[PDB]
Symmetry: D3
Amino acid sequence: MIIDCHGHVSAPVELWAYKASLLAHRGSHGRGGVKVTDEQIIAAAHHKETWPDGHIELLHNHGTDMQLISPRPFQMMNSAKPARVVHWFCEEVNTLIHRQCTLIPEMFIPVAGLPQVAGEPIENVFAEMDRCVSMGFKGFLLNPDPYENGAEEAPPLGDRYWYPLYEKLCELDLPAHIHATGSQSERSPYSLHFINEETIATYNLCTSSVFDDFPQLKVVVSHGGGAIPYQLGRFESQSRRSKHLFSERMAKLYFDTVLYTEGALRLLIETVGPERCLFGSECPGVGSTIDPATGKQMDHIAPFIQKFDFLSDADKKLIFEDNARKVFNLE
Amino acid sequence: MIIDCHGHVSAPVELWAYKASLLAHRGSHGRGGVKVTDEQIIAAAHHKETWPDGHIELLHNHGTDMQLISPRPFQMMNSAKPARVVHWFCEEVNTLIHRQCTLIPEMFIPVAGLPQVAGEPIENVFAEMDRCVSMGFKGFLLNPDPYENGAEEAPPLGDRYWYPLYEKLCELDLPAHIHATGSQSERSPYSLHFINEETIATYNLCTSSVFDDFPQLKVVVSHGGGAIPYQLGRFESQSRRSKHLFSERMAKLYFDTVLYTEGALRLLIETVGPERCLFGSECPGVGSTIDPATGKQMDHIAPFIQKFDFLSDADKKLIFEDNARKVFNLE
Amino acid sequence: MIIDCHGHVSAPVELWAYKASLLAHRGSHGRGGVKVTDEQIIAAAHHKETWPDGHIELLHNHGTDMQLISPRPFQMMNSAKPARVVHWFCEEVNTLIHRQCTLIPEMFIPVAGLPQVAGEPIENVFAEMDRCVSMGFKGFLLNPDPYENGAEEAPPLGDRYWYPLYEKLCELDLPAHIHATGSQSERSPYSLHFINEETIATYNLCTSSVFDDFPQLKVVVSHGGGAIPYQLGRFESQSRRSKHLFSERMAKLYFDTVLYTEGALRLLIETVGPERCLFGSECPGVGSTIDPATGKQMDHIAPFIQKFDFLSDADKKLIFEDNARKVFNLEV
Amino acid sequence: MIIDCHGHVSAPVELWAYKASLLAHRGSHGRGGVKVTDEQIIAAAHHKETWPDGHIELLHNHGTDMQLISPRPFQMMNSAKPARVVHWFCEEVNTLIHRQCTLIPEMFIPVAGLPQVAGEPIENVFAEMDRCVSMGFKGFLLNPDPYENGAEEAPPLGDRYWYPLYEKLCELDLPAHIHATGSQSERSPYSLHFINEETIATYNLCTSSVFDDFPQLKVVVSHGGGAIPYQLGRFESQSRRSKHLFSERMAKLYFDTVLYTEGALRLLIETVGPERCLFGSECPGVGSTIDPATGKQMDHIAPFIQKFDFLSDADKKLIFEDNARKVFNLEV
Amino acid sequence: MIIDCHGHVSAPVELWAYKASLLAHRGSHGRGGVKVTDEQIIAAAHHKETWPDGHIELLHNHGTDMQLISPRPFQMMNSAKPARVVHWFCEEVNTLIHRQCTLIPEMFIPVAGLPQVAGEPIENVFAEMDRCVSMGFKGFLLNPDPYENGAEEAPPLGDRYWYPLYEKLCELDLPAHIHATGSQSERSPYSLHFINEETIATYNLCTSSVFDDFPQLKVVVSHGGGAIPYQLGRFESQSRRSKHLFSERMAKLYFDTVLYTEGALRLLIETVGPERCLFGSECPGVGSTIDPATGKQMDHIAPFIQKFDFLSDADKKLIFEDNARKVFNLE
Amino acid sequence: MIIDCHGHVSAPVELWAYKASLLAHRGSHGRGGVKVTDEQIIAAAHHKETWPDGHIELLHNHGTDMQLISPRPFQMMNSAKPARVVHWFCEEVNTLIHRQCTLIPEMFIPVAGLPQVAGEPIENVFAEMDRCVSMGFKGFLLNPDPYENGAEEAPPLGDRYWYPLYEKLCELDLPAHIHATGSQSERSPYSLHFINEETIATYNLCTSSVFDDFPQLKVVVSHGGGAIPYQLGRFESQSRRSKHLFSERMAKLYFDTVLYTEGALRLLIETVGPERCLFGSECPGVGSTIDPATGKQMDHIAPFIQKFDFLSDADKKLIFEDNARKVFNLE
Ligand SMILES: CC(/C=C(\[O-])c1ccccc1)=C\C(=O)C(=O)O
Ligand SMILES: CC(/C=C(\[O-])c1ccccc1)=C\C(=O)C(=O)O
Ligand SMILES: CC(/C=C(\[O-])c1ccccc1)=C\C(=O)C(=O)O
Ligand SMILES: [Zn+2]
Ligand SMILES: [Zn+2]
Ligand SMILES: [Zn+2]
Ligand SMILES: [Zn+2]
Ligand SMILES: [Zn+2]
Ligand SMILES: [Zn+2]
């Protein structure tokens, strides 16, 4: 089968209106919450909206059997104040993902957002993690820039600021899916910030002692590692002047295949090997447009991997399901 | 012949001491200047230093016949204060590069740094440009982040802040060579900041109307365009939702081949085409380490391009000299 | 008839989702816009939402014949970055209001928000004002604190920063309706910031030369003038030292009656007079809860004014329609 | 008798000069102190200053028998640096008040200021409180905005930042008298910031669990509660969603009657009841100007309360003495 | 006779209470002003207060015939906000000095404060200067640090920011008396800040083109030039590496003799010469204490100058009156 | 003999290049270190550079027999970021001074810089102190303004922030040598900042209870105490109003004689006494210019002190060696 490990929830419109409300009253109305029926959630999983077809129908047309759906990361406003609106909105997004996956278990698998408030100690997400574990969540999006390209930065991923999280992720044996959220920059909007932050997080993890101290830490890097597989040479060369090679740590990482050109998919898989690649597409999303040359949808990239003549059937099965089954502890 | 369009001056130690001195007295001793002889300038280009050999010796070994040399960008301190030390140090480095390329015209071709002070209008570099144009300089390093990964950032390259510079570059029909300088981030050291800044600059140039207003502007993006050829799919798909495709703007851009893996070189050349690639290696520097297994130096990448079977000998001539002669107006 | 001069649009949820999206991509998707059909705009004016009944049904129950609807001001994020998102959102809200008033003209009258970006010159709203003027809009919400209780504040209303706007309004003979937006303070939330900012704006206007320089300027202060009618004594006393009395300038101002206690309404009307009071309720909204002692909604305040012994039927007609009809240039 | 619970010290000019000097040398001359004789402290309570007559003469004319005098709060510079100057000045004002009440005991009762330094833990006032408690002081002015309308603000009164103080006050069975100090805003000067901060403090106290955790806490809000009695309806309505009604907590609060209009006094008394109103005038002060329509000083408000038809003589005795005598632990 | 050129007004207490009031209501009460009778001002000139005797009586005991009285500079709060309180308080101090000098013309001469608001253009003092010229004022205190040792600095005295003032001072042929005001620093309180700022202002004036561009500019530096006469050597040595000597400019400056040790007075006079020294004492003030060795008052320094055996009677007359007569255009 | 207690290392050019390199890569290349031979270290002390002659040659000519050398303070960049480059550069300069004084024990005696990072607790220098104590260092340069004339400043020297250091200095019975470093001010260049900071530090030490708590603490103030001996009168008069006279605290202090005018030298020695003066010249440096009239070099000041008639030969022995031997524990 084909399990897509990088998907984002198609939610009822009421969720985003709840965000607007929280930002309007900033808590003076109390927490409240999203009021939507199961019917409305299911219908949201079918609504066309801005995509060529519905979420479910698109996955069906592309042969994707199941998909791990997480929050749409650029809505999560990790730099917004006050902090409690960040926490509340994260919790409600997670609740809605849980409801949708319970209503549509034949396709959708839950992955959780973290209520990362810029500047707060990472411990402040543990409670929500616990709530999500009980609800059956299979992973967590880890944002390396809760400041959302502001004037300040979070510590690098090798800083012990993040160590309490790694510990917990190993106790649960659940993965962190690197994903930045929004960006306050006029130069670098969110979709490009994703790439730069993936590059930075990978670099941090591959030039620190994280994997010495948490050898079972499972990390999936979004969008084929940002820039790293393409730029691996300079970083390996510079890592020679040190006690560990960049590739030494990088061999511990997993990467999803959210890349919309055959050449990039080929380079990713040849660089890290099928043992460390998990099929992903972000369909529906950035890539849900039609290539005017072929008429196909750009995020319908499974056939590119299925036709690579340098991968065995075992390697393609690793990429399409087994790696996801292990990393996300899927039933 | 082989022309390397991305090299950095091996300078006598007195230049860096002059930088330190300027920062120490901050102008209270006057402008002063570097004090070195022609002999010391020539000797610097043969001294081993940390490299496996002298700059010129490594070029001779790798088969490189001429190299365009610019300042070592991470020393240019565009965010340093007061402004006058940034200007003065840029001026002295340019004067020294001029002296070296006049003393050794067989190997070296001069490329200038711009005295970009964070927050200053871009026109404040024009004077220095003129001076360098009178000294035979063939291009300019354009830093998209003169704030050097600080609390603030400059406007995106599509902003009209930069338009006075594009004008002048078209007036001179000379190219800009995109290259960041330092990085103040504890997460992102300068060598990774290079890549991210190239990604951002290319994105700005390909999502704005710069090339509609300056069709003749010549721009060379360093390090194979950061993440862009690898991440082209998502940005092209997103651009489909606008009036001009990312690809039609990117077709106007040139990229150098400072990539230290065969696979990345292949991906670059197959994505942008040999008509838009200029050979470059940054030898000596980040890539001047010996692969302990295969015995060769990582920045010795000309043979990779020579052996690509999908390139004709004319395509290889383009990559190795003709594009450089056209873009940098080489004699 | 009964005209309610202080109402806020009951809009389809797609509008608030559009706000969320604008904040999410900060303009990198383009302006885009609210995509919503006429039938959705109509249905939103009847949906119960968190109120006991729909907007229109409530106005019917309370006997209100027409309401001037403006944006829900605590959503207008005047302090948000980048500036273009606050401009775009204000514009979208204005056009949606225009559409709703065009579709339900027997009930709703359009009042526009201003795309006030904290720190921008006020002239930057004119382009939108002009547009709204050609769409038939009858007034503009004026926010004295576009910084939304931040680390900085805007100039007081007496400062010449605002004088271009005061000029244009007089050019148009259309009123400003003082209304604050959001509040970033952890001490003073938006509903209380409304009152504090009404107090500050009224004080600014009654201690400067705005009305000397703009005699025909029409200004309606929300929520019965905040604290001023209750605290008028101290301000009058301190003004005695000045060249003009506080009351001298205050008499040029209009106030709406959005007060949810009979005593407050009595004080307001007895303080500023029926010639300067315009009926308003903000129904549905903060006051749309049941007073258990009466069983009636707290914002069903028209009967209090109707049953005031100290007002003639002509004064009540001023409060309930004539004043609004003249201040907001309404048709008849 | 008539006890005025809101008065401010008429002090010799040497005190304000001492403030100026403290700001001038910022402590490099040492703490020093106000150097002023008993005769000067007495003379200051009779000097006309900018008022029509002396402090004591005015209180005599108005029929006030005793007044609780506290610091002039707009001078206490809680946002000034370095912290030690605000501490020293508060201490000096407190001791001068103590001396004046010791010299004129038939008229004046001491109420202390707190040396609140913006950003300091509240515990840093305890040492002064203790001292004032041993000097016979009967209450403390509590400033909810020691930042004085700056770029930052203090925690709301419901925050545990204030809980130590609430504890100590209950330990002492002495009241806090809500009063803001200065205002750095160019829109909202100090006299209006008083009202806005009273509104914010009252809202904080009526929407938190302060009175659940400190049931016997005695709090007197200045100037008739700012805007709250006039704007109570909206806050009650919004509180309905909470677990406690706004009025539920508001009933635990006391308010002084420093309002210079008959209508405002009527509203206050009818809203909170005579059991929670303490007569206060701030005479001499902002209200010490002549109402031309009456010839009487605007802060001569006791007759309004005396002539209210809807109050028994016993309710008026509560307002004029019993409530102050019980809240401020006064002798008889 | 003995004319003391550095004195500060002994004002009625009502002035400082007016300062406190302005800072309390910040303008909401309107400008207002100081209400004091002539009798009260005269009495203030006699009040003991904190000094061993009254101002007038102290000048009498020391043989000082007349004294130029200016504001007490550390009260002038040039960094306070809003600006109008700074302007108003300056104007009222000047009005009171004018009244006192008119009431006591047998001794007191008026010198004016400038309403210098940190960050405002210097032109904003011209109006008050004019008001003071009409009232007969003989000079102006010039503060080189209106920021009062804050996080920011004013431009150096050679910056053209100050040029409109110099121009005006030459049109009036009236002097600037360098005097800092207050200091917000915990390290360096006002009395020491005076010294450091005198040093900085002198350095600025002696390493810039001020005296090239305003050759008739009259400047009196307080407290014997801060540190400069004592430290003149290093600055002269460093000025040799430049187009003008430090002493070249320094010869244009005047210095007052507010120094309370014989050795410092000797060094000042021997360094700059009697032609450029104006007698000053700041009595009553910092120096109004008793030397327990001699019983004399430390600011009774006229006899030190009268007994120096290296000065002629003409030099002592230059120091004690003629220089003041010329510089301050005294009747 | 003549011992000069205020000299600064003439270092090989590679040290300043190492500073520039550290600032360029900000630690991403690791600590590294200066790479110079014993021969280059020795040659640096004989190279003319800008001086009229080599460092050692000038010392020989002036009659100086030994000199205590410390870092050139204006290069130590105590306000630079990140902290680790400040620490590393201080450590390398100290190691180089150690190498030079071990190679040339006839002339040079080692004095250490402190790795003071602005805002760091002072205890963060103790480690380095210990290392230097194991290398035979005889004192430490104490910078009162590690913020280098910035928006912020450190606590005054009387604040208990510094008390841990006083303790250690008494534990080692070694002295602090007050000396500022750089200055970010556009009004006050580093050479004037030296003087002002010495004034402030001396004032703090003489108006606080430091010497009541550390009676044995040894402190040497540079440049004759900035302004203090010249401005002593006002501060003594002000201190009379307190519990301890300025003079009784100042009597515990030592001062060096880095003054380039005879008159200032005289004033210093007559104010503080020969029992508290240590000869010092800062030769070569700011004072190494030739008086074009009198032919001699300005920092050749030993003869001035030799010719003072009011000093006995024992007083001159104190100034020229004994005080230095006692304070700096010289062998
Ligand atoms: C600035 C830079 C520096 C080095 O290569 C380098 C220098 C010294 C030691 C080791 C490496 C490279 C580039 O600009 C580039 O990568 O294009
Ligand atoms: C402002 C000033 C203050 C005093 O003189 C003073 C004031 C009150 C008590 C004690 C001293 C001195 C100077 O400006 C100067 O020293 O020139
Ligand atoms: C830092 C310093 C620098 C010079 O002397 C100097 C250096 C290079 C060229 C010219 C002068 C001196 C002192 O520390 C001092 O004055 O004590
Ligand atoms: Zn994603
Ligand atoms: Zn490069
Ligand atoms: Zn409203
Ligand atoms: Zn009061
Ligand atoms: Zn003075
Ligand atoms: Zn030195």
